[PDB]
Structure formats: C-alpha cells, structure tokens
Design a protein around this ligand. Structure first.
Ligand SMILES: [Mg+2]
Ligand SMILES: [Mg+2]
Ligand SMILES: [Mg+2]
Ligand SMILES: [Mg+2]
Ligand SMILES: [Mg+2]
Length: 756
DNA sequence: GACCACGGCCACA
DNA sequence: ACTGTGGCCGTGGTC
C-alpha cells in the first residue's frame, strides 16, 4: 500500500521516495530516473534553440534547461504540437519558468507548477491506499502551561497523552497516581519518552486534533529550547511545516499525520467544533472540558492534577476513536483522487476535482489548461442561471411524494456530451442544442468531461453491486465508502466548470447544464399536473413534492408509480426520475424551508431554523416541538401550548442560559468588515483584549438584559455569570422564539399575540 | 424616527 | 476559493 511520496536530493539529482506498507512492514522504494518537466508552446519550432539556452539563478547555481522533446498532445480535444522541457532538479522550474514565459517565441507554458512528487503519482499511474493492508494508528494530544499575555509556548508542556488499540496513557513530569499515568522528571524526559513510545510503536498514522496548528508547533518550540532532536519521521527527520493558505500543516515523513480538525470541519456541520462538542455529536456520550486557567492553577498549586490527567487522557482517547471513524473513508477518497491521504484530508472538494481531472487528462494525453491569470479571472465573473425554484404552495399538505432525478447534472453532461472540448465544435455530423442558451455540443466523439463522468457513474454502479454481494463486513463498508465518494465527486464536476479558478472552466457548458435541468424539471412538472392530475407543491433544482388533492395515499402512491413509468420513457438517455419517498404530511414555509414526516414517524427538516447554527437552541428546540406537534399529530392546540409555555419560562428567566447562545462564524479580517453585526461587535471587543480572531472563528455570544444595539450588550458565553448577568428575555422571546414558530402557525391564523 | 435596503451568515440542490 | 438560488436579521442611512 502506497502511503505518500516525496523526494530527496543526492549529488544534485532528485530521488523520488515511495513510502509503502507491504506485507506487514514499512518499506521505501527509490526512483532515480524520474525527470521534472513542463511544456511550452512555440510560434515556430525553430525557436527551441533560443529557449533551450535560457538561463536563470537559484541557490547560487545557474539553472539551465536539460533537454527538449517534441511531443503531440491534445488541447481542448484538438491536436497540438508542444515542446517538453526537461530539467535536472524540481527547484529549477520556479527559478526559470517565469523567465521562459516572457520569451518572444513562447505563446504559453503549461503544467509548470505541479509538485514533483505529486507529478510522480500521476505520471506513473500509482494509487495511494490500495490493498487490504491495515494501518497501525496512534493519536496524541498535549497539555500546556498557559498564562495570559505570554509568548507562544513560553510555558512548558505539562502532559503528553497518546491512545491506540492498547489504551490511553499520559506521560507527565509530576506525580499523579493514576494507572494510565507514566511519571518522569523534567519535561525534557517526557518529550524524549514520547519519542520513545512513537518510535517503538512505529504507527503508520499520527492522529491529532488541530495538530497542524497547535500540538506540533508547541512541541517544536519546546524541543528547540530544551535541545531535543524531535525525530518522529520514520527516516529520523523532524516534522516538516508547510503553508496551508494563511495557516500551516505538518508532515511526518514516512507516516501520515492525520489532523482530524479539517476532516471533521467538512464532514460534519456543527455549531462549534471543539473536541468535546465533536465527540458528543459523533458518539452521543459527553466529554468534559477543563480549561487552560484550570490546568495552570492545578499545575502550580499541585492540587487536583488528577482531573487534568483525566482530561489529557480523554483528549487522546477520543481523538483515537474519531480517527478510526473518519480515516477509512478519507483513505478511500485518497484512493479516488490518486493523491496522498495527507493532501486529500486537507483539501477542499474543489481542490480535489482538479487533481482527479489532472490525472485523467494525463491518462488521455490531454494538455491541462493553465490556471487563470488575473485578466482572465476578470473575464470569468460573468454569471449565469441556476436551478429552478418554485414558490411553495405555502401551508400544510397531506399524502405527498418526493420525486427526484438521479444525478440530474451528470446525467445531463453524459447524455448531451457537455464538455469544453465539444462546445460549438465545427464540422460535426451530430449535435445536441441546449435550451435558452443555444450552445451546440458535438456528439461524434465523447468529450473529456462526459467520458470521465460515465466511467465514474459506471464504476459506482459496479461498486454498489459487489457491495450488496460482498461477504466480508469491512470490504462492504469500504465499497460503501467508494461509491458514496464517487457520487460526491461526480456532482462537483459541474461546479468545477463554473468555478472562477478552474482549469476546465466553461461558462457555456455550466449554463447549458443548468438550462437542460430547468427544461427537464419544468417539463415533468407540467406533465404530472396535466396528464396525471397532481399538484406540484414545491420544487427545487432536481425534484419536486406533489400530491393529488383530496386523494388517498394508495392512490397517490400507485398513480405516482404510473407517472414514473410514463415520464422515464419520455426522458432521453441517462435521465431518470425516481421515487425518493412518501410522507404522511408536510409543512412548507418558504423557498428552501420545509419539513416532512415519514409513515414510520421520522421527521426531515430543511433550511428552517432547526437546522441553523446561528439560532438560539431555545428557538430551535421550541420550533422543533411545534413541528412534531403538527406533522405527527395535527395538534394545532398543542403547538400553541408549547409556545405559551416556553415564552412564560423565558419571561421568568427559568430557561437555562446555555440554550440562548448564538454561534456565528468570522469570515474575514476584522479590518475588512463593512457592517458590524453583534457577532463581529463581540469579536472586535475580543481582539481588543488580545484574542486571535481569524477567519473560521466561531463566535458564541449571549444577549444580556438592556436596551439599544444588540451588539453593545452581547457578551461571549465564555463569560456568562448567572450571579452577575441577566440575559435579555425580551430579546429571546420576541426576536428568536416567537418569529420562528410564528412563520409556521400564521398558516392557521395565529398572530404573535395569540402565542403570548 | 418610522421605513427600508442590505451587509452578512448559512441553508438547499 | 465547486455552482446559483434563497430566507432571514441587526444595523445604519433616508427623507
Ligand atoms: Mg507529499
Ligand atoms: Mg490541541
Ligand atoms: Mg433538448
Ligand atoms: Mg463563484
Ligand atoms: Mg428539489
């Protein structure tokens, strides 16, 4: 199983290292033959001699062009004659590429910025994380001595915890009498001890939670001060720091540092992403938090260090469990993209399609288009039309079915051969024409994008079959991961075609896809109402809810089964309207806000406040209860009882203040805010007391009793003292709870007055 | 100083 | 930095 790749230098020449795990043991393959290269497009091939003599400067050494090969690749499906420029070392390309672009006779250079070791995974057609090879893992967290107004890592590391299959344990340089605590003297002896434990266990994966930004950085600083060789690398190297936009990530050569924080950021949507919050969300059991002030006071008085030892042990223990939950799927995603788990677990879904496409393009000798320059980025701000959204037949409904298209946009791309290399291609013998936008798409040959999407969705269906037949339990959920990941990857290809900074940007393709989706959807909505007598209640991009007025459920079910047969014969190619589900009732508020109820009894909520992070828990709780009271029982008078009870509780300040917290993210530099809402009024006051407020910070505030601007009297919930503060009951009654339940109960003639 | 457009956040498909 | 479509509110600007 390939685990990562990099390269070292030997007498100037680069050497690819493939970090594998084969037949139970770690091993390193070395390749001294792979040469670095990029392509160049010339006016006349004669100029190759002027450019083969281009020169530049790096490391006090002159970078020159090794050799040049003339090759034929495709660019936009067209036969193009390009010049392959080889170099001796990867670091030659930055030093000389910009000087090459500016030569008179070069139209453009391509694929000039692909990391050498990632280039290798592609050019050699190798796949990380392939095989049944099981990986030995190890989580670790640290405790620190924090004082306000101190430099980062001014204080020592107090505890180092680690967990795996064998259990959780804490090293610490003070006596705590707990069976899982290993005591040493000095923190230098705990760090060397941790190195001893990691080196002995030789784990394939080191799982942290924000170890990209705290744990490894703190360990580094301490190791510099105490003169410790912090050689976690399987080659004996120290952790390597890379830039991650305005952040950092840490490599451990020969291993996979799997930081769970970015992974869980994208995979789960939570109000706050503390280790304790994420653990409760994922496993249903709560995790207790002890704070830095608690930890420092415990360490310097020597008292109650055992609860700090328990916190550190749990940090590692729960970090191992989340590692086991989130790693296998991310290892399947690594397999799909053809990039290392370290990279993929730190990449956006938008970044990954480029890597997948890059690999496919190389498979098909297709010259990857360059990333856009800033002038083209401005030509790419033209907008287009998206999905059709119907104003819901606002109110409550009976016996409704949801019909949705199977992968509407991929079906469209495949069926009509939508690709930048098929758009308005001249001299074809068969075309399809997009509605409204009128873009013609050649069909003589399958295009780049439709070929991959077909291979992808074909593979996904193969996977799902072998899965349902698989006789191994792990391989089952592995295959389950692969096909689930293929579905997400398929429907990010449309988003790519419209993305500002996408290599295969094609606005004409992107708007042709949405145009076809709107035609097909509004057509089926027309046919189901006219031919079959339904009424479409609400329709977003690729589906709709509908029923037959004053009709049975069995009548709605069977007749809808009929309409599916009728409409799927009318639908061309891979388009397919399917029967997603039946629901006994459903309330529809506005566009993007509804909630339906199974005949088994499960409620599904969409877009309403119940699903919103930035709404108080008391409002979401109470609205939920009002939904159940209606969808489950039609008890319009139980719903009003709920609201009157809740408002009475708030007015008596009887509601737990924990339910009144509002979570809003910071998205930019506070310098750059033009409008200051309450959460950025809190933030600006926090930074004024020296708190790091970066993009991503989840402000969590409460509104205290008073008058005037909400922001002027909102405080962080970190600082709510029920003996020194009264929350603003009037705000949470009148500006949170009532407005949320009222949008629903207005359909039955209830004003906010009727809800007390 | 009542009325409102709207930065700004997050949801949906 | 995957897309477009959309609801909602605290805030300050407006005649
Ligand atoms: Mg790497
Ligand atoms: Mg930490
Ligand atoms: Mg058509
Ligand atoms: Mg955009
Ligand atoms: Mg829909």
């Amino acid at each position: 199983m390939i685990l990562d790749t990099d390269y070292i230098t030997e007498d100037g020449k680069p050497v690819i290292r493939i970090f594998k795990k084969e037949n139970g043991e770690f091993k390193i393959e070395y390749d001294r033959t792979f040469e670095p290269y990029f392509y160049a497009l010339l006016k006349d091939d004669s100029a190759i001699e002027e450019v083969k003599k281009i020169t530049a400067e790096r490391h006090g050494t002159v970078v020159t062009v090794k050799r040049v090969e003339k090759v034929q690749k495709k660019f936009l499906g067209r036969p193009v004659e390009v010049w392959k420029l080889y170099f001796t070392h990867p670091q030659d390309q930055p030093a000389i590429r910009d000087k090459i672009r500016e030569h008179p006779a070069v139209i453009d250079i391509y694929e000039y910025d692909t990391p050498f070791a990632k280039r290798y995974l592609i050019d050699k057609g190798l796949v990380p994380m392939e095989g049944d090879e099981e990986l030995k893992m190890l989580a670790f967290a640290i405790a620190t001595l924090y004082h306000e107004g101190e430099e980062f890592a001014e204080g020592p590391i107090l505890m180092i915890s680690y967990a795996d299959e064998e259990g959780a344990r804490v090293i610490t340089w003070k006596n705590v009498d707990l069976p899982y605590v290993d005591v040493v003297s000095t923190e230098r002896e705990m760090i060397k001890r941790f190195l001893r434990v990691v080196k002995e266990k030789d784990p394939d994966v080191l799982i942290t939670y924000n170890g990209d930004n705290f744990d490894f950085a703190y360990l580094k600083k301490r190791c510099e001060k105490l003169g410790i060789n912090f050689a976690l690398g399987r080659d004996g190297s120290e952790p390597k720091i890379q830039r991650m936009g305005d952040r950092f990530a840490v490599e451990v050569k020969g291993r996979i540092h799997f930081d769970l924080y970015p992974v869980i950021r994208r995979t789960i949507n939570l109000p706050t992403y503390t280790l304790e919050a994420v653990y409760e969300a994922v496993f249903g059991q709560p995790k207790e938090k002890v704070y830095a002030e608690e930890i420092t006071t415990a360490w310097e008085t020597g008292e109650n260090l055992e609860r700090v030892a328990r916190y550190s042990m749990e940090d590692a223990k729960v970090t191992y469990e989340l590692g086991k939950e989130f790693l296998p799927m991310e290892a399947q995603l690594s397999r799909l993209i053809g990039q290392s788990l370290w990279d993929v677990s730190r990449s956006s879904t938008g970044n990954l399609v480029e890597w997948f496409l890059l690999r496919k393009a190389y498979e098909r000798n297709e010259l990857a288009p360059n990333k856009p320059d800033e002038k083209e980025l401005a030509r790419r701000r033209q907008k287009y039309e998206g999905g059709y959204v119907k104003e819901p037949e606002r109110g409550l409904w009976e016996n409704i079915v949801y019909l949705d298209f199977r992968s509407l946009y991929p079906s469209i791309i495949i069926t009509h051969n939508v690709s930048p290399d098929t758009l308005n291609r001249e001299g074809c013998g068969e075309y399809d024409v997009a509605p409204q936008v009128g873009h013609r798409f050649c069909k003589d040959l399958p295009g780049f994008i439709p070929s991959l999407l077909g291979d992808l969705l074909e593979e996904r269906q193969k996977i799902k079959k072998k899965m349902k037949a698989t006789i191994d339990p792990i391989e089952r959920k592995l295959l389950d991961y692969r096909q689930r990941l293929i579905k997400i990857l398929a429907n990010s290809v449309y988003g790519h075609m419209g993305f500002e900074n996408a290599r295969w940007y094609c606005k004409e393709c992107a708007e042709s896809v949405t145009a076809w989706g709107r035609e097909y959807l509004t057509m089926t909505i027309k046919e189901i109402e006219e031919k079959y007598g339904f009424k479409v209640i609400y329709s977003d991009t690729d589906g709709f809810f509908a029923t037959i007025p004053g009709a049975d459920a069995e009548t709605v079910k069977k007749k809808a089964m009929e309409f599916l047969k009728y409409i799927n014969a009318k639908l061309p190619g891979a388009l397919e309207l399917e029967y997603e589900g039946f629901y006994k009732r459903g309330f529809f508020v506005t566009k993007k806000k509804y909630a339906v109820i199974d005949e088994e009894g499960k409620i599904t909520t969409r877009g309403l406040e119940i699903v919103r992070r930035d709404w108080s828990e008391i409002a979401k709780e109470t609205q939920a209860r009002v939904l159940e009271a209606l969808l489950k029982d039609g008890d319009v008078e139980k719903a009003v009882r709920i609201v009157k009870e809740v408002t009475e509780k708030l007015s008596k300040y009887e509601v737990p203040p924990e339910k009144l917290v509002i979570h809003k993210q910071i998205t930019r530099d506070l310098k750059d805010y033009k409008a200051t809402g309450p959460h950025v009024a809190v933030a600006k006051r926090l930074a004024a007391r020296g708190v790091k407020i970066r993009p991503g910070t989840v402000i969590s505030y409460i509104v205290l009793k008073g008058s005037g601007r909400i922001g002027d009297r909102a405080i962080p919930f970190d600082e709510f003292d029920p003996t020194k503060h009264r929350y603003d009951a009037e705000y949470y009654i009148e500006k949170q709870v009532l407005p949320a339940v009222e949008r629903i109960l207005r359909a039955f003639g209830y004003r906010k007055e009727d809800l007390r």
